[PDB]
Amino acid sequence: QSMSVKGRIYSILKQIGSGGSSKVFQVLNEKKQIYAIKYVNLEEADNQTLDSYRNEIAYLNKLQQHSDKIIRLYDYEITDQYIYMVMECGNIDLNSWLKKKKSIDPWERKSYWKNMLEAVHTIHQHGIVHSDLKPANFLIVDGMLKLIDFGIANQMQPDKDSQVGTVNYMPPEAIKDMSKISPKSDVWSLGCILYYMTYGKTPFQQIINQISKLHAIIDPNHEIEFPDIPEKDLQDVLKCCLKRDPKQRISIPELLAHPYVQIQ
Ligand SMILES: COc1ccc(Nc2cc3c(-c4cnn(C)c4)cccc3cn2)c(OC)c1
Numbered sequence: 001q002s003m004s005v006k007g008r009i010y011s012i013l014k015q016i017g018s019g020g021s022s023k024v025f026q027v028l029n030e031k032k033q034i035y036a037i038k039y040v041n042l043e044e045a046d047n048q049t050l051d052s053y054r055n056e057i058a059y060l061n062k063l064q065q066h067s068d069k070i071i072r073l074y075d076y077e078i079t080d081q082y083i084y085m086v087m088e089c090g091n092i093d094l095n096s097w098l099k100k101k102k103s104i105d106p107w108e109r110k111s112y113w114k115n116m117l118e119a120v121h122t123i124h125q126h127g128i129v130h131s132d133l134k135p136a137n138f139l140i141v142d143g144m145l146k147l148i149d150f151g152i153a154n155q156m157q158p159d160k161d162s163q164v165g166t167v168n169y170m171p172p173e174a175i176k177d178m179s180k181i182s183p184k185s186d187v188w189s190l191g192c193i194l195y196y197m198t199y200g201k202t203p204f205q206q207i208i209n210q211i212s213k214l215h216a217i218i219d220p221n222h223e224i225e226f227p228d229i230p231e232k233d234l235q236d237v238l239k240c241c242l243k244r245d246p247k248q249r250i251s252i253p254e255l256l257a258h259p260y261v262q263i264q
Contacts, residue, residue, distance in 0.1 A: 003027070003037065005077045005084045010037060016089075019156035021045065026089055035074070036090070040083035049153075053083060056153040059128060060085075066126075069119035071139060071146045090139035090146070096158055098135055098196065106231065109197045112138075114261050115145035116190055121252045123150055124183045131181055133189035134169045135196070167210060168192060168202040172218045172244045184246035187255070191241025198234060199227065203242060220244055233260040 002011045003025075010027040013034075017024040021041040028034055040053055060073045072088040094112070098104075116138065123130060130137070130151040137155070139146045149155065157164065171188035173180035196202050203224045207213040216222040224242050229235055237260045240250035255261065 003039070003084065005037065005086050006075050008075070008086075010035065010086070015159050017156040017158050018160075019162075020154040021049075022154055022156060024156060034089045036087045038083075038085040038087060040085075042080065042082055052153040054078075056150060057083070057085065059123075059126070059150050059152065063122060063126065067118060067122040069115050069144070069146055070122060071141070071148050088141060090141040092140050093136050093148070093158065094138035094140060094145060094193075095135035097140055104197055109194075109234075110260070111143075112145045112197070113194055116147075116193065117252055117255055117261065119145070119147035120186050120190060121256065123147070124186070124252060128152075129181055129183055130186050130189070131174070132169075133186055133193070134166060135193055138193075167213060167217075168205055170214075170217060171246070173246050175214050175218050180246075182246060183252060184249050187241050187249055187252060188246075191238060194234075194241065195238055198229065198238065218244070231260070233258070233263070236260070 002009055004010075008029060010029055013026040013028060015023055015025050016036060021044065023039050025037050025039065026034065027037050042050065042053075045053075057073075057076060057078070060070070063070045064073060071090070073085060074088070075086040077084040119138075120130065120133070128150050132151040132155070136157070137148055137151070139148050169189040169192045171185040173182075173185060192202050204213050204216050207216050226235055226239055237250075237255070237258060241255075243249040250258075
């Protein structure tokens with residue numbers, strides 16, 4: 001099968017992912033260049049869902065010129081029935097990659113981390129707080145990590161359980177506030193991803209019961225374990241990201257001036 005976007009024809013190689021009323025396909029243009037096209041079916045979409053997709057497209061377009069750590073959006077077609085977004089095609093998402101890998105290279109972990117900070121910092125500059133960061137929001141595109149979405153609309157999974165979620169990256173202030181959400185909330189989630197890339201587990205994964213897990217995340221008495229590692233700077237980053245008090249938690253601008261990101 002093939003699809004048309006702004007008078008340009010793309011042939012479908014395969015479906016990469018799905019989630020709700022959206023599908024992502026690996027496609028080729030006439031010159032045999034690879035792209036990823038995101039198709040959103042708007043036929044059963046409520047005003048709230050519509051506005052979320054409009055807001056996600058607007059921010060992707062706006063952020064193109066600000067950072068190359070944001071996934072490229074080349075073109076799009078939006079009607080009342082559907083949305084087509086032509087984007088750069090990545091090799092794999094970070095969650096699928098972390099599930100495969102037995103061990104991560106220290107240099108690779110540092111380079112990916114730098115990319116994540118730059119991408120998240122860019123959205124923060126524009127007043128966006130993602131609030132739902134997790135490895136699946138990151139795409140590996142020829143050695144560099146790029147942010148795929150802004151947490152504004154529907155997330156997707158590779159191609160399966162539509163019920164699947166994770167509270168493993170959720171910050172304490174988001175749970176306590178039941179507005180406490182700030183850029184600091186994304187620092188905690190990034191901290192959890194880096195903790196996963198360092199210890200091979202998220203800080204609270206060992207807790208089965210979801211209620212108990214949420215209780216441990218907000219409990220000041222539940223001490224997060226930071227076992228000794230050769231990179232002392234990395235250990236400091238982790239501890240600074242995973243402070244329960246968001247006022248005491250490190251900021252992204254400070255994380256970008258950290259020895260861990262700036263020094264070999
Ligand atoms: C698990 O296997 C794969 C994961 C990702 C890719 N690339 C890819 C995924 C994209 C997703 C998306 C879809 N699902 N997720 C989690 C992100 C959205 C938007 C653009 C994308 C561009 N490129 C892939 O391409 C061969 C294979």
